Structure formats: C-alpha cells, structure tokens
C-alpha cells in the first residue's frame, strides 16, 4: 500500500520477535567414540555406528 | 572614567514593532494588516 505515519521503535521489535534466529539445543558426542560429533549425521572419518563413510 | 553609563531622554525612545518574532507574542504574522487582501502582501497594485 503505503503507510499513515513513521512507526514507533517498539513496533519494529515486536514484529521481529517471532522471526528471530533459533537455538541449536546444545551439542553432541559420539555414542561409540571419544570423538566429538555432528548431531544425527556421520563425521568426516565415518564414526557414528562405525564402518566407513565419505572416502573422497 | 564614566563612559558607558548613558541613556536617552525620558520617553523619547519608542523602540518600535519588529514583527514576525514568536507565535505566543501577540505581534507576529501579517504585519498589523490582518488576513488576506491587497494590503496584506508586499507593495504592488493600487496607486496612491
């Protein structure tokens, strides 16, 4: 459209409260090693439930 | 020395209207000419 007036700065922050960037919910270690993790993927060295993955 | 203690004769200084200064002043807008018409604008039209 257009608008009536220039808006207040409280308005700008209420409009931005829901669009806000969302939590990662803490971190992972492997179930099967002393190696640090990426949640519910397999690491660059294939550790998750072992075997081998990403041999590139 | 006595300098800078002078002032004009009694009531001699009228001081006069400045106009156009403040809005809470009484004096201001138009000049003491009122709203709109030939005599409110800058000097043109009617002959003496």
């Amino acid at each position: 459209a257009v608008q009536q007036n220039k808006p207040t700065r409280s308005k700008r922050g209420m409009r931005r409260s829901h669009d806000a960037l969302t939590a990662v919910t803490s971190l992972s270690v492997d179930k099967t090693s002393g190696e640090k993790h990426l949640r519910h993927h397999i690491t660059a060295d294939g550790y998750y439930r072992g075997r081998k993955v990403i041999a590139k | 020395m006595r300098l800078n203690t002078l002032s004009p004769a009694e009531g001699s200084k009228k001081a006069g209207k400045r106009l156009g200064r403040g809005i809470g002043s009484g004096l201001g807008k138009t000049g003491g000419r009122g709203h709109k018409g030939q005599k409110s604008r800058s000097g043109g039209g009617v002959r003496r």
């Binding site: 960037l21 939590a23 803490s26 | -």
Partner: protein, 110 residues
C-alpha cells in the same frame, strides 16, 4: 581484562548481522562459541573470526584467563554503501543500495 575486536566494511547488511547476534547476547564466550558453531550460515563463520579474535587477545598478551570472559557488547552498525541503478518500469532508474556492516565485538571479564 577487556578486548575489542572489530571487522569494519565486512560483506553483510547490518540487519542480517543483528539477527544472528541477538542469539548470542550475554551468553559467555565458550557457550556462544558453541552456539555459533552449530549455526550453519556463512554470516556465522564471518563473525566467528572477529568474535574469536576478541577472545584470543585476552587468552594472550595483556589478559589473564578466558573463563569469566563474557560478550559485554556485541553490536553492528551501517557501513559504507555503494549505490547502484535498479532496473524498473517505464525506464525508472531508482537507487538500490548495496550495504556493508561495521561489526563490533567487545569481550571483557566484566
């Protein structure tokens, strides 16, 4: 012991930086550095080097310890825009402004 890191004229609009930054306000340095790591975004790696640089000069130099270090200020400001002609109706040649950000990390033990 207090440290500023800035990166000024960095390639992001400051609105897009302020988004990520408000996730990590007040967090303490180690908890925020984990929160940033599991943010996949390219903005989050750009900011990492400046946040990490803040943290590194307390871990060294004039500082001692990083365990009570906290992100005391974290803020982003309008950097220098290069102005470009936007193609638009009836040969309308309106400005589109290609933004950069001035990014400030302040960490302190404070």
């Amino acid at each position: 012991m207090e440290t500023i890191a800035k990166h000024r004229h960095a390639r992001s609009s400051a609105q897009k930086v302020r988004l990520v930054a408000d996730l990590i306000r007040g967090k303490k340095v180690s908890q925020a550095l984990d929160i940033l790591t599991y943010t996949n975004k390219k903005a989050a790696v750009l900011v990492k080097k400046v946040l990490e640089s803040a943290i590194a000069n307390a871990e060294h130099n004039d500082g001692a310890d990083i365990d009570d270090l906290k992100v005391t200020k974290i803020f982003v400001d309008e950097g220098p825009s290069m102005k470009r002609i936007m193609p638009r109706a009836k040969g309308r040649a309106d400005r589109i402004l290609k933004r950069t950000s001035h990014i400030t990390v302040v960490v302190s033990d404070r």
